[PDB]
Amino acid sequence: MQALLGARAKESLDLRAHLKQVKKEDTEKENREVGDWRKNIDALSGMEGRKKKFES
């Protein structure tokens, strides 16, 4: 009498687990573009004088 509710609840879980496993495998396999970068600055602390350009 319960054989089908077991089987039906399982079919739903197996499909949901499949679909989530597919997106999770890519989420976990590669993760660099999903991260961040230093984005550093210039400051010009070595600028002890004027440049060679006529504009400086």
């Binding site: 679909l19 997106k23 890519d26 989420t27 590669e30 993760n31 999903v34």
Partner: protein, 375 residues
């Protein structure tokens, strides 16, 4: 230079263009779909200055540029500018020439044929990509969401697609493609802000309004109660900082603009709105397929970030829907980026490696091949 020749993945919308490589969970970079051109006479010499700017360059130097968008309502009308965008997107920024990698592009399933054909043609003839596959955007939204069944309503900048998919199959007779989108919400906001005393008409002004919308606007799940107060009191207004230090406040207009997705008449459009099109995508399917589509309204694309859109899209459908039935909105964090993410997922499937147009089949058949091999 790469570990494997996986596909490059890029979602080209009417708003943003996003790209990265297949197998990751994010694009490396996002660009506006823009090619910019100077609208002024140069006077100083040796200032660098390009004849045309692409993507973020176009937006960054926009102070003296007129900015054009090559994509409108989901299709490419200016392929030359998309060629510039793809070069920048794939080679200048991801640092990968398409010549050595398959490329996965995207388009809606009822997207005019010329666009899926042109995307196939340019990547094969100007970039020499070894393979092509133009993805169904709804499919990618489902891949990113972890669903096989549901209505994909992608409310992007270009077009709202409204497609019912059941067990991985489309129900095409029930697709309600609608020419109501995020780009119209931006122009409506420029006009309503003009009514408030803050006129916006130029490219710079449009980019400001798009920034205002993205930070200040919302849908409101119950707009009648929300406007009764927002239109009556300053306590519901939110301030926005403009590039020159000016401050604009927006009240009921803050949600009235997004409200157009439910009230299309605000922009002169004849439409039922996105909640009724979701309803009809469900209702026009057979009764043994609607009980699953009602329980799976799949939100995707951009504009989905407005607070109240998911609840506003579930309440309206529930009101149109039969009683007893459970109506459910799925609105994951992979919003706006779900198509790109799904693209990455599709590209990495082992079964998808049999779906590619090779740069052999392409030349034998020509670009019309996209309809024989992709969709």
């Amino acid at each position: 230079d790469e570990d494997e020749t996986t596909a490059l993945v890029c979602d080209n919308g009417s708003g943003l263009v996003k790209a990265g490589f297949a197998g990751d969970d994010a694009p490396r970079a996002v660009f506006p779909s823009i090619v910019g051109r100077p609208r002024h006479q140069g006077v100083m010499v040796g200032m660098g200055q390009k004849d045309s700017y692409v993507g973020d360059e176009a937006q960054s130097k926009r102070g003296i540029l007129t900015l054009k968008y090559p994509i409108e309502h989901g299709i490419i009308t200016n392929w030359d500018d998309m060629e510039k965008i793809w070069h920048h997107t794939f080679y200048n920024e991801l640092r990968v020439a398409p010549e050595e990698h398959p490329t996965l592009l995207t388009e809606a399933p009822l997207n005019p044929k010329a666009n899926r054909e042109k995307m196939t043609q340019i990547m094969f003839e100007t970039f020499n990509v070894p393979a092509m596959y133009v993805a169904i955007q709804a499919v990618l939204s489902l891949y990113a969401s972890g669903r096989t069944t549901g209505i994909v309503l992608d409310s992007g900048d270009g077009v709202t697609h409204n497609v019912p998919i059941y067990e991985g199959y489309a129900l095409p007779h029930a697709i309600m493609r609608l020419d109501l989108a995020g780009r119209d919400l931006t122009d409506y906001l420029m006009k309503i802000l003009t009514e408030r005393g803050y006129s916006f008409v130029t490219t710079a002004e449009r980019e400001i309004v798009r920034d205002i919308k993205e930070k200040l606007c919302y849908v409101a799940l119950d707009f009648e109660n929300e406007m009764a107060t927002a239109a009556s009191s300053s306590s519901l207004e939110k301030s926005y900082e403009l590039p020159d230090g000016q401050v604009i406040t927006i009240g009921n207009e803050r949600f009235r603009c997004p409200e157009t997705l439910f009230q299309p008449s605000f922009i002169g459009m004849e439409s039922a709105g996105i909640h009724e099109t979701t309803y009809n995508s469900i209702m026009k399917c057979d009764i043994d397929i609607r009980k699953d589509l009602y329980a799976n309204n799949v939100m995707s694309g951009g504009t989905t970030m407005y607070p109240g859109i998911a609840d506003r899209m579930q309440k309206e459908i529930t009101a149109l829907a039969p009683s007893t039935m459970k109506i459910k909105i799925i609105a994951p964090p992979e919003r706006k980026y779900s198509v790109w993410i799904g693209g990455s997922i599709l590209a990495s499937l082992s079964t998808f490696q049999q779906m590619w147009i090779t740069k052999q089949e392409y030349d034998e058949a020509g670009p019309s091949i996209v309809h024989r091999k992709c969709f």
